[PDB]
Symmetry: D3
């Protein structure tokens, strides 16, 4: 259902790109003034997109929404190229002193691209059949979960030994499920049977729910200032919502099967 | 031009032998009632053995045009064995062959190796070999997975009573899992991650690991040849994975030099 | 009670022997026709024996059973001898490309032996004092438990990382209980105090009950084609019953104590 | 030797405090304008101190060296206060968005406290006798090493998995050496025998050597951009130089013990 | 009222650690060589001294005249000092290898004397009207006790028969777990007074309590298994009980402080 | 080659008695050390065993390869009764500890049982000698490794447990050896079950090979720890003579491994 889904995607992901520019900005060196401005530009861009998405509704004219999709797709492409650009400066050591992790940069670029791609599937009636969506969403989100588990463990203060270790065991849980998901993807279309796919979702579910439960707790502790970390609480909430979205997808794909 | 000829003969002398051996290994995994599948495997064995013989008869003086035609026929043999491995996998995954003995990972593994070969031939035939930074990343992302799978197969095919070597295999298994992920990340970070320093460190880190597995596979192979250890690894399988490890090592050293 | 016991043993173990003959035949190469024919021979002979034991009842003439015992006890000596001949051929590498694990072969042979000597026990009335019994069965069966955890781990498709790992944890669990059993053994009969034996039995039960559930779970998943393995739906059922059986014995030993 | 040792200590630790000033400012948010310039002030104070230290010689009037020590002591007290104040802002979440690890702020404050305490010992004639120094230096420095291994592992890009895991193994190695150090410490003066302290120095030396070498290597790969991290090259050379001084101390205690 | 709280606290402190110092006297005597008779005799007098101090501590009441309790604190603190000196003398003898054959872990001797020292310093706090405020109490007590629980896990693991592999593995896990909390506690402590926020202190207590409760259960079960003869060890049943009571003490303190913080 | 694997009746006898008599004598001291001071029956009974094996060791050392095979044969049967006696004593002690009849004593039950296994092995070896039934090489290889890999795995726990827990590095090293030999022992058990099929020269050669690297390494670790204890350089409750006692036992296992390797 094109209008339904378009707006869901955009409401969620544009909040994400908006938040991304804030985080990337926090990690720029103070003197990198052009990059700080770009970041602020993209901040307001996606902020604006966000407001527009919320002001639409299921009863909005499909054509108007197709144009919005096309427009949001172009913003998703522009934040993407911006992230790449930062990645190349960091990776060539052009920004000594800077505090963006290359992996987080690449990470946020993959989500931007997940976003632009989804918009194209929508505007093209090229959504995926259930067998393909189960594999591709999982292969995608399981890497994203594994990434978050490392961001948290890296941004936790090293004195927080027990929570650093807990995030470490989540970073290994998802490293390993991502690999099962990579194998399952190579064995397609042969792997794409009812019983293999149901088991695959079954097994991912218990972890994601656990991780989601963990990001929530972590978020509340950070907000209450109960732990030591360089984790901005908006970041903690952000990865919580990404986890929570993965879990909804997993649960709805398990209903469709 | 003559170097198109070298490179095609090297690729075929190596991978044709691998495709022929795959046919043997897969058939060894078949239940004794699967005569069609068994006979199909034997056909592919005969086919690639014959492709291998031809490839060792041609030479660096051979007409580039007859080499180019050999490539397209060999590339079609590759497409077909790939097609056949895919059908075996389908069957395993739907439990059509209860009692069969081929790991589905092994069936996808060898089928991945047929695809590698397929695409290399096309690359040569079009004169479309990758630039150094893409080759490096592409060859490794692929071969590090292969080494990772090897280490698992060895570990699963060793007899559970050979605790020390099973444990060693699992340590290798763990390292190449780790190296594949580093390569998946590099790959995602490309072209930004394709700088001289990053790629030299990537290859350096890989080389120490690959040479060590290479040595373990050889030592394993010598032991299985003399019945010094307990397993269900046919000696030729031990030799096969040792050869593919050696191949990978030469390629890394190749690129290492091209860059350094 | 000599009769109920014999038939219980024979009804259970003959099926185990029938089943080995079939598992072994699948490791045999297609060229190895004499081995295949002999294995199908032991399959047919224990199946026949299964059938005979399901026809008898606790009413049956003692002597007609004391001689069914000796019959069957010969059949178990013979299958034992055959699993041994397979072992020798495997260990000197005269059958390259076969798919039976030497550990598997020595393991069937140990089970086969166990049966042989139990029948002897039943006919000689040399059945074990309770303290000696608890230590003997547990040593034997813990080891069987420890091998099974390995066979499961090795015969699962390597792409089943989560499940391979679970089997490995069990494997280590049971190696540990066995080494504990072994030390109690050497400490016998000094170690054969009621509380020591009661603590022994308690520790082992938690693990055996775990693994039993795992096996049941795994079997159900392979039957349903939910997981990637080269474990036969029958083999999984086979180790489940041996697990199940061992738990019966443990529970009964705690009761008589 | 009062002058020698003062100058040695000052030349080393002044560069260290100057470097902290730089790392701390990198961790501040851009609107933290007063923090940034307070950091830049210490940067300068200590560069100047470093310059003066480097221009005096073993032959300088002890009375001027004594006064320099006292001047340096106060500078070290003030940056220690500055470090603590920053610790307080962070721990009460007054600075969201900032990127200085509280552990790192605490750690640099512990280094400042060490510097300042060594200047007092110097000026008072109250340096430790050997068996006390051995235990005290090691208890202190082994902790410095455990932290550094954790800072390295955290500041490494998460995708640098082999290097992340090597750093963790070093963190684990040093936690364990530090706890051994803490029990020896509790067991003193009884544990202060030549044999126990000889073996202490020996166990410790080998991981300090490996760690120094890992730091050298990390520094060189970062300088050459061969790996991914958020570790300024200078932070790499810095911890490398703290590892090296610990190792020089171990070697000189070992010589004295023998 | 306030004098009554001085008295209550003094007698709680003394009732508890007088028992501990006494038992330590026994434990250490058990680990001496049979030919070390002067040491054994000296251990035997300390047992008897704390036995009597414990007796008197249980006969005094909350109604006891504070001046007398004060005099009692001072004398028992002199006894604490004296057994500390003894424990340290022994540690010396061992670390200079002069008792080949003895069976007391030097870590244990040193552990016992840290508890002797704790007891001696609590009594001076009580007598001088100088108890820790809540923020410092919370950090000083956990720092002390976390090290104690860590040591205990080690002793259990070393004193279990090696054939008890599962139980040795649980002790060792608990040991690792408490090394970890101890080291969190040492970083919190260095970050004081900045780290002394109600929020950071509440989480510190919560995180420690999960562990201490869990080890407390374990030490009780182990104690019962040993009294019942169900497991193989060289752990005197009383020693198991002793370390259970110290865990229980520590869990009390965490609850009383969680309460007073909330 | 120092006689450990000799098949000459006299030489092998003296070698075995010289070595194991000293071992049992030292067990008599170690066991005594773990008794409560009030258990004087035990203390006295241990001192007597200490005295017996001390005596036997001096006599073994007085005999030569030239001594009359009839004397040696009677000596062996005496020494064999002695070994049966100390074995029963150790089992008695074990029984007392397992019924918790001695609260506060310090001998591990695994240690007591382990000393009774070394005793039983002395026992059975002298019976082989007198009856003329030393094992053929493929059996000796399996049987000795199974016995001695267990001895080695027990020792690395004895060291693990008797080191002060504040020696974290060394206690961790002990544990790694302990796990290695657990694993080597379980390999031998399987090898032993798979016999006589497994007794091929290639499988026994690999077995010994793998066994050797761990044994030489534990041997070296035990010599090093011995020297650190004599010097007072580490913290433990390991008597310096216990450290040397388990070094001599590893060392002998190493001769056996190296000599079997040659013969093989
Ligand atoms: Fe995001
Ligand atoms: Fe291949
Ligand atoms: Fe079976
Ligand atoms: Fe510093
Ligand atoms: Fe205590
Ligand atoms: Fe011994
Ligand atoms: Mg994300
Ligand atoms: Mg391959
Ligand atoms: Mg079985
Ligand atoms: Mg530092
Ligand atoms: Mg205590
Ligand atoms: Mg021994």
């Amino acid at each position: 259902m094109f209008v339904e889904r378009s707006l869901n995607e955009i409401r969620f992901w544009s909040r994400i790109m908006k938040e991304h520019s804030f985080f990337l900005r926090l990690g720029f060196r103070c003197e990198d003034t052009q990059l700080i401005e770009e970041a602020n530009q993209f901040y307001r861009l996606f902020e604006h997109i966000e407001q527009i998405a919320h002001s639409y509704t299921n009863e909005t004219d499909p054509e108007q929404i197709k144009r919005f999709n096309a427009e949001v797709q172009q913003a998703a492409t522009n934040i993407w190229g911006f992230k790449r650009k930062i990645l190349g400066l960091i990776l060539t050591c052009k920004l000594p002193g800077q505090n963006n992790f290359p992996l987080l940069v690449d990470h946020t670029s993959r989500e931007a691209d997940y976003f632009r791609k989804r918009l194209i599937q929508l505007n093209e009636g090229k959504l995926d059949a259930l067998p393909d969506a189960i594999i591709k969403e999982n292969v995608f989100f399981l890497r994203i979960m594994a990434d978050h588990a490392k961001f948290i463990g890296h941004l936790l203060d090293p004195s927080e030994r027990k929570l650093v270790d807990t995030a470490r065991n989540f970073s290994n849980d998802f490293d390993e499920l991502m690999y099962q998901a990579i194998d399952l993807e190579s064995m397609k279309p042969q792997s794409q049977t009812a019983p293999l796919l149901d088991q695959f979702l079954d097994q991912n579910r218990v972890s994601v729910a656990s991780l989601r439960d963990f990001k929530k707790t972590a978020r509340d502790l950070i907000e209450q200032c109960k732990i030591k970390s360089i984790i901005h609480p908006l970041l903690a909430d952000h990865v919580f919502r990404e986890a929570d979205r993965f879990l909804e997808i997993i649960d709805m794909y398990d209903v469709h099967l």
